[PDB]
């Protein structure tokens, strides 16, 4: 596995949907950081 | 004025203040991005 795939996993794990994790990853132009502040900011986790 | 007009407008689409805030702070400011969190994730 790769780096990012391994970020995509935990945060899964963590109740985030695909579709949002995804979503995320595009608006912050795939910075990382950025994309788990939007998700726990504003992303509902089941 | 230009960056006030920004947040009345997004408030007239029915996003709160401080979800504003939050969704430019994230995008450190750039307003366009900002624009796209309130979209995708924000209650309006």
Redesign the interface.
Same mark, same amino acid.
């Given at each position: 596995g790769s780096q990012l795939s391994s970020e995509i996993e935990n945060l899964m794990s963590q109740g985030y949907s695909y579709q949002?994790i995804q979503? =995320?990853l595009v608006?912050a132009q795939n910075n990382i950081e950025?994309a788990k502040?939007?998700l726990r900011?504003? =992303?509902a986790a089941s």
């Open positions: 949002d979503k =995320a608006i950025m502040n939007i900011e504003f =992303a």
